[PDB]
Enzyme design. Structure first.
Site, PDB file in Angstrom:
ATOM      1  N   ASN E   8      35.996 -70.903 -12.690  1.00 13.39           N
ATOM      2  CA  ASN E   8      35.242 -70.746 -11.473  1.00 13.39           C
ATOM      3  C   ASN E   8      34.079 -71.724 -11.569  1.00 13.39           C
ATOM      4  OD1 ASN E   8      33.290 -69.712  -9.501  1.00 13.39           O
ATOM      5  ND2 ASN E   8      34.740 -68.019  -9.305  1.00 13.39           N
ATOM      6  N   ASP E  10      31.904 -72.189  -9.037  1.00 14.58           N
ATOM      7  CA  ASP E  10      30.913 -71.758  -8.054  1.00 14.58           C
ATOM      8  C   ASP E  10      29.487 -72.199  -8.416  1.00 14.58           C
ATOM      9  OD1 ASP E  10      32.431 -70.287  -6.135  1.00 14.58           O
ATOM     10  OD2 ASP E  10      32.348 -68.483  -7.381  1.00 14.58           O
ATOM     11  N   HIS E  11      29.052 -71.836  -9.617  1.00 10.08           N
ATOM     12  CA  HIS E  11      27.702 -72.162 -10.054  1.00 10.08           C
ATOM     13  C   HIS E  11      27.344 -73.634 -10.150  1.00 10.08           C
ATOM     14  CE1 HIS E  11      27.558 -67.966 -10.381  1.00 10.08           C
ATOM     15  NE2 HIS E  11      26.751 -67.844 -11.420  1.00 10.08           N
ATOM     16  N   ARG E  19      18.798 -77.526  -3.725  1.00 11.01           N
ATOM     17  CA  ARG E  19      18.066 -78.729  -3.370  1.00 11.01           C
ATOM     18  C   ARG E  19      18.568 -79.513  -2.163  1.00 11.01           C
ATOM     19  NH1 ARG E  19      13.543 -78.301  -5.947  1.00 11.01           N
ATOM     20  NH2 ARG E  19      13.098 -80.043  -7.382  1.00 11.01           N
ATOM     21  N   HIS E  44      34.620 -69.393  -4.723  1.00  9.07           N
ATOM     22  CA  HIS E  44      34.392 -68.246  -3.882  1.00  9.07           C
ATOM     23  C   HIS E  44      33.601 -68.681  -2.641  1.00  9.07           C
ATOM     24  CE1 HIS E  44      32.226 -64.100  -3.440  1.00  9.07           C
ATOM     25  NE2 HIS E  44      32.965 -64.414  -2.392  1.00  9.07           N
ATOM     26  N   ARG E  46      31.657 -67.733  -0.151  1.00  5.54           N
ATOM     27  CA  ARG E  46      30.875 -66.618   0.337  1.00  5.54           C
ATOM     28  C   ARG E  46      30.603 -66.823   1.809  1.00  5.54           C
ATOM     29  NH1 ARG E  46      26.135 -64.474  -3.274  1.00  5.54           N
ATOM     30  NH2 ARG E  46      25.629 -63.932  -1.088  1.00  5.54           N
ATOM     31  N   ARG E  50      26.430 -69.465   0.082  1.00  3.18           N
ATOM     32  CA  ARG E  50      25.353 -69.571  -0.873  1.00  3.18           C
ATOM     33  C   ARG E  50      25.541 -70.812  -1.763  1.00  3.18           C
ATOM     34  NH1 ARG E  50      23.724 -64.149  -3.486  1.00  3.18           N
ATOM     35  NH2 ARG E  50      22.578 -64.316  -1.496  1.00  3.18           N
ATOM     36  N   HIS E  51      26.735 -70.964  -2.337  1.00  2.00           N
ATOM     37  CA  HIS E  51      27.062 -72.102  -3.197  1.00  2.00           C
ATOM     38  C   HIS E  51      28.191 -72.899  -2.555  1.00  2.00           C
ATOM     39  CE1 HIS E  51      29.944 -68.992  -4.455  1.00  2.00           C
ATOM     40  NE2 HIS E  51      28.934 -68.277  -4.916  1.00  2.00           N
ATOM     41  N   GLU E  71      38.507 -67.276  -3.864  1.00  2.00           N
ATOM     42  CA  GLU E  71      37.965 -65.911  -3.838  1.00  2.00           C
ATOM     43  C   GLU E  71      37.281 -65.759  -2.474  1.00  2.00           C
ATOM     44  OE1 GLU E  71      35.180 -65.529  -7.171  1.00  2.00           O
ATOM     45  OE2 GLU E  71      36.845 -64.946  -8.465  1.00  2.00           O
ATOM     46  N   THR E 101      32.598 -50.863  -4.754  1.00  2.00           N
ATOM     47  CA  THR E 101      32.681 -49.659  -5.572  1.00  2.00           C
ATOM     48  C   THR E 101      31.331 -49.543  -6.282  1.00  2.00           C
ATOM     49  OG1 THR E 101      35.057 -49.580  -6.000  1.00  2.00           O
ATOM     50  CG2 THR E 101      33.578 -48.802  -7.754  1.00  2.00           C
ATOM     51  N   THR E 102      30.978 -48.362  -6.780  1.00  2.00           N
ATOM     52  CA  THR E 102      29.696 -48.224  -7.466  1.00  2.00           C
ATOM     53  C   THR E 102      29.750 -49.103  -8.723  1.00  2.00           C
ATOM     54  OG1 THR E 102      30.009 -46.477  -9.134  1.00  2.00           O
ATOM     55  CG2 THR E 102      30.021 -45.809  -6.803  1.00  2.00           C
ATOM     56  N   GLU E 152      43.112 -58.192 -10.265  1.00  2.00           N
ATOM     57  CA  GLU E 152      42.273 -58.788 -11.276  1.00  2.00           C
ATOM     58  C   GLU E 152      41.323 -57.679 -11.635  1.00  2.00           C
ATOM     59  OE1 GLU E 152      38.601 -61.998 -11.543  1.00  2.00           O
ATOM     60  OE2 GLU E 152      40.547 -62.713 -10.773  1.00  2.00           O
ATOM     61  N   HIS E 192      35.901 -61.997 -15.043  1.00  2.00           N
ATOM     62  CA  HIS E 192      34.530 -61.862 -14.592  1.00  2.00           C
ATOM     63  C   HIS E 192      33.606 -61.339 -15.682  1.00  2.00           C
ATOM     64  CE1 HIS E 192      31.037 -60.459 -12.380  1.00  2.00           C
ATOM     65  NE2 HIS E 192      31.427 -61.234 -11.379  1.00  2.00           N
ATOM     66  N   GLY E 193      32.559 -62.098 -15.985  1.00  2.00           N
ATOM     67  CA  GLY E 193      31.621 -61.668 -16.996  1.00  2.00           C
ATOM     68  C   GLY E 193      31.993 -62.019 -18.425  1.00  2.00           C
ATOM     69  N   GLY E 214      33.817 -68.253 -15.071  1.00  2.00           N
ATOM     70  CA  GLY E 214      33.036 -69.332 -14.501  1.00  2.00           C
ATOM     71  C   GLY E 214      31.626 -69.381 -15.073  1.00  2.00           C
ATOM     72  N   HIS E 215      30.824 -68.391 -14.722  1.00  2.00           N
ATOM     73  CA  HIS E 215      29.451 -68.332 -15.173  1.00  2.00           C
ATOM     74  C   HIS E 215      29.142 -68.626 -16.648  1.00  2.00           C
ATOM     75  CE1 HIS E 215      25.551 -66.220 -16.109  1.00  2.00           C
ATOM     76  NE2 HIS E 215      25.193 -67.087 -15.180  1.00  2.00           N
TER      77      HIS E 215
END
EC number: 2.6.99.2
Lengths: 242, 242, 242, 242, 242, 242, 242, 242
Positions: E8, E10-11, E19, E44, E46, E50-51, E71, E101-102, E152, E192-193, E214-215
């Site tokens: 990913n 994205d970042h 900028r 992704h 969004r 955002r990105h 995504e 979801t919570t 996923e 993710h994560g 990704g991150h």
């Protein structure tokens, strides 16, 4: 007019001939160096074929992207070979006690006819001749008188200096010789024995055209790789000039 | 029990001795290789000191971080030197026509007393002896009978195979010899002539303990640097085993 | 042994011929590849010498440290060139449409006489022949019958697969084809159109002897450099078989 | 005074096109080059789209981070595309025989009407135009008389110079052509056929604004990677001015 | 088969968007990663862009060499963009309070009607759909009934695990959930994560098909560069399955 | 003297903050950059702690090997933090509408009372103050009267220059403004918005003391890694003054 | 010549002695440094052989390709060791508080007799002596009077400067001290405490012959590796003088 | 089953402390190591803070991205700090003679009250405790009887083994000690004194959970950089288990 660097790959062959295999192949090294700061490749075709062989010369002549500098003795065989090969440069060197001086340079001032014949002959072949000689003004003068367009000053005595005073001495001699040769219409090279620590002082001498270095580079190569070894030498050489 | 690799730095000295300078220094190469996949350094102290010199052996013995494998002929001089030096390993090799076989291996089966004396002598010095021999079961048997703890099979015939059938032939011979030597309590090494292209087949032979490779590595080194040259060889060797 | 990598350096020369310079030179590429994971070098001498020229073949034949695999059309000119060049391997490919099949491989099942002749004549020169054909049982059985020791399955369709389903299908076909071919005593290669993302499924096929890849590797070289391009392809291939 | 480097990535595309795949992708090479010393990226959009294609120009235009220099023949199709594409620079080049002189340059002297119009039209779209001409005073005057901000001297003959003398002769031609062009208010460029070995003498020439190099850079890239190929060229150029 | 890696990026756009500049350009990261271990590229889009922006998707769709994993939230806008874009994969993710979801994953059990419609519509378009859900049975059964071919699992909770106990439990939860999903005919992904220090436990889960990370990659890349970052991740993953 | 480079690592925290993870950690970037060409490290403690957080400042203040340049808005909170932190430098920047210029720089002419108080208070603390202003005379005179020892010109407008004309004008504006500031006894800095392609023109301005660049560096780093990114910037800067 | 770099490898051995192993070995460090920009190697034989041992000196003396600079206290033991070792350079330093001064350099002005004696005795052994002293005219005049050919100004205070003002002051003092020293026929070195961020101002001083640096280089080596650590220090030093 | 590597950065600090400067900084080494294969970072907080200091532990605790393993003597000071610092792991070690056995390990057998309390106290703060003991059954039982989750076998004697036999003897001792420790429910570690040459045989031992290595890694780092030092060690460890 950038100070040029010719990389002598002779010892790659030394390394190959020790076991009689095909590797390492001088042909590969030539590619690496030409792309790493070398403006020319130098090969010495000895009579006993210690390292560089006729094969080497033959294929290198077809693979070099820059140009060949054939180091060779002034003998019928080698003269014939060079005329056949048409290298861009040819560097006549002593290989016996009669052609050598007390310092290991080509005795030109005592063999004027032989050198005169050799020069015109190589020149008719379209070859630019360089007479490898001592920082001797007599030899430098004779070199000019026999028609050589180049002379390569022997920097070995300087390289082997045992004390700094002795070294500074050999430096001055070399520098004055270069200036003198230039005032005679000669372009002047050097390089024998030069290393990563004593290359700068020579590179600074303005009259210097190209430096033919071999061993120190190949010796650095076995550790770091030929690419960086050649590149470091060229970097140091250009720093000397600025 | 990882397949070990001993790097023979002899040719670094070859390169140095060509000009009689101090560089390149075998001492430096030893450091590079030990940190790049070499489990031991091998040096052959020839009688004529072609390359590795007594200085080399003397300082290397103090600088190696792993261990020394002294290749040497079975002569009073060398026996004395090794006993004095206390290398971790010693590899007896032929250096004349009488000690050599038709393949270049140490003639053990015909010099049992000389080899027996040499082995106990080197063993009393605390040295682990390896008899360099052909993939010959007779020599392999004699080697065991004279008390050597190791034998290094000569992989040169295999390396020089001219056809694949000839090569496969030499491979099988080598493999059966190794198995046979092991059934005699010998640990078995190989390595002479091995290259980046034929090293895997040998590395796969389970009985192999350590491979003593030199030339191909040093020949790769002048191009890529000693670090990567040694590392590549060890990488290929371990792949062979998995 | 392990899956071997045959690097095709044709596109090095397509870059060259696009200008008429001597650079880049295939001779250099070959050296880099041979030291980066390549077990053989491949060159396709086209009738229109579009990229690889006769000079390339003549010199390469003298510089390669491994062995040459010469791809060529089945014509008197090439066969004569091939018999004389004596490369280790020869891969007969179609250059004219009366030579090709539906998918694109040589048409052996329809030209059995010419193929039987070729194979015999090349094998007589000591060359090991491989017939480039589609994953077609008919062509495979014919390749065998005419005497070829190798066949190279054309992996184009699988590499060109426009969907995951079409791909898996092409895969299965190649694998079943390979097994059949083996059952006929044939050794099998592949590699055309293979890339960094689709090479593993092919290398995972057990019957695969050697993979001959070009375009994808050279394509990655312009970005990355040949050394790493090759080592990557090789790495992927060996991971697939573990 | 600050010599700029403009990388032509046409041959990244020729490689790709020789196979019909998506790679290597020019879009990737431009990012690599723009971050390794390139101040602009050049692409020659030929009539037969043999390498760079309309997609390339359309995407490269939205992905370049520096600027685009569109090389094209003077036709309605091209002018039209250029005007729409709005590239920063435009280099008018000969694609047909009736538009090229005897040495290669664009024939401006003999098409003053066609060129005057191209310039005004492109200039009207905010595009800075350059005429690719020979180091010939007659053509340089025509260039200035017609209004082009820039001219790009064709270093083709200097690059192809066979002898050293012939090379120096061609260098002086270029340097006087540039000084002259400058005296008429033109900004002058060069680069065609320059290599890692002859670029410096051209970069030394004061009047040079930007050098557009491609082939030698891409040809170095298949060996070392595009990044170092580009960074070396830049380094040599700035060394020449230093 | 081959455990895959979707990167990913994205970042990358996150750094850019801070900028309004054009760099760093997602398009460059893509080429880098696909050539360093990525098997797919994930972005992704969004709602608030955002990105990743529409141009990123528009151009990536044209430059990616592997394939796109888009995504996106389930909204008519995004479904139309997806149907137009035709990315190989589509991962439906929660973006608003009502869809989450919570624990963070997509609430499929709560939007069975909506999701069913999305899966069908995206399916008729030829897009393989994945639902971003928690390692929860109710959501998996929901994902199954609705027709999604993939799911996923949200490895978030496992990644933020505070103790070695907390972590081992979440691991177990995912391992079982993955097996549960497979018994239902679903293919399973995660990622993710996941970081360089916790990825191996997940990669070792047999049912895992592809890891979308990704991150942690971008975060490592800022220091070491994308290439090694991506290559390193891939390696750890392959190590896990060996 | 030495033109300096302050590296703003704000955007490292930007990548981190997009996830609540601890990586990438600004602290690591700092060591990397200080060891690669940075002479100082700059961080902007925004009021909303968008990226840089108090712990970042708290720890950086303890780990930096060179010194901290704390960018901050003028608020009692920040002045107290600055007086407590005691960073070597402080750059007062606009964060709210009332404190900004239509061009973006700090409005000192409009807040002479506030700024004067800030400069004095920060000064008695031993912090060298810089005011982030536009290349505008009124703001510079204001900065001068208020007592600020330094000013940092906003190179933003120059960086976003749309044409070569627009850019050349903004350049000129800064060059004159820098000279104007110096004639007033102010030291001058710049950097904001400067990239790898436009930095040299600014670095060449004699009055420039230190360049505070961040965003273009981080943006290059995501691809090549911080080290080379920083080192490359430094080099371009030194090239400008040579 | 150009500013020379004397690399002190003492801390390589402090790392070693911290455990009693043979690694890391100073002998290796010396080789790496000599090839990375170092013109000489320095070692400080302390009376407590805390790091550098006698074995280090004995072996180094045989392995260094450049020359040894031996730092030592002025005691009969060291002088005897020094006379026997015959290093190229010798730097007399204070090891006891009755030897040191206010700032920390040797106290020559107060021990003229012992110093005159030492210098004579070492010069008699052919060693070139350097007296490590503060930038103090009294000490400098005395160094000269006692016969020393060199002095090394202690740069600690400047490196320890707690403020920019204290630093610039220490700088000015060192520079004025160097000039005075030169006027007395002395050659001058420096380097203690010099770092990557403060070495340029010192190297910029014209009278500086050689800079002997240790700690800062080794400190960067643990992160970066010696090769690059040294090459960096060297690079910075030569930039300062251009 | 997945062997973890724990890097001890104590000697990065010893280097620093030998001079009183801020560098090299342990905080930097931890980021480098954590991203090169280290799963945890160890620091030994000695009573005389000879290397690691309270600052180090305080900052390292807020900067580590993996986890901290605090080595310390069993005292009130240390326990107290550990409890406050809340490190993930804690390794109880001997700092005094009355707390160390005859070979080096922590004397648990003879201080059951002291150890039982340490464990319960540290365990009460959520710290996983390990007792640094010898490969001695009496001590392992005491360890288990007292409640420690872990034990770390002292590989000191194996590392110091003089002869091969002595080494194999010590290996078997460790391997049986580990198997035994495992049978009593203990997780077992090792690492003290392991090198790039002896680590593998220890990593091969099944029961090994984590290996804590420091000196050999840092000693390799001054030559090659910490990253490769750490990545090599990790690579060797996993090779041993493979």
């Amino acid at each position: 007019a950038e100070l040029l660097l010719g990389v002598n790959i002779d010892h790659i062959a030394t390394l190959r001939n020790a076991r009689g295999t095909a590797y390492p192949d001088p042909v590969q090294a030539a590619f690496i160096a030409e792309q790493a700061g070398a403006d020319g490749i130098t090969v010495h075709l000895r009579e006993d074929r210690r390292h560089i062989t006729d094969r080497d010369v033959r294929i290198l002549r077809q693979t070099l992207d820059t140009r060949m500098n054939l180091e060779m003795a002034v003998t019928e065989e080698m003269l014939a070979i060079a005329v056949e090969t048409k290298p861009h440069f040819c560097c006549l060197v002593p290989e016996k006690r009669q052609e050598v001086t007390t310092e290991g340079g080509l005795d030109v001032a005592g063999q004027r006819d032989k050198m005169r014949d050799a020069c015109k002959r190589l020149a008719d072949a379209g070859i630019q001749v360089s007479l490898f000689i001592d920082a001797d003004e007599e030899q430098i003068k004779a070199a000019a008188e026999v028609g050589a367009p180049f002379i390569e000053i022997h920097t070995g005595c300087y390289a082997d200096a045992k004390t700094d005073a002795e070294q500074a001495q050999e430096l001055a001699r070399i520098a004055k010789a270069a200036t003198f040769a230039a005032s005679l219409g000669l372009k002047v090279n050097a390089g024998h024995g030069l290393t990563y620590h004593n290359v700068k002082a020579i590179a600074a001498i303005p009259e210097m055209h190209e430096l033919n270095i071999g061993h120190a580079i190949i010796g650095r190569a076995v550790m770091t790789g030929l690419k960086d070894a050649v590149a470091e030498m060229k970097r140091l050489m250009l720093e000397a000039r600025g």
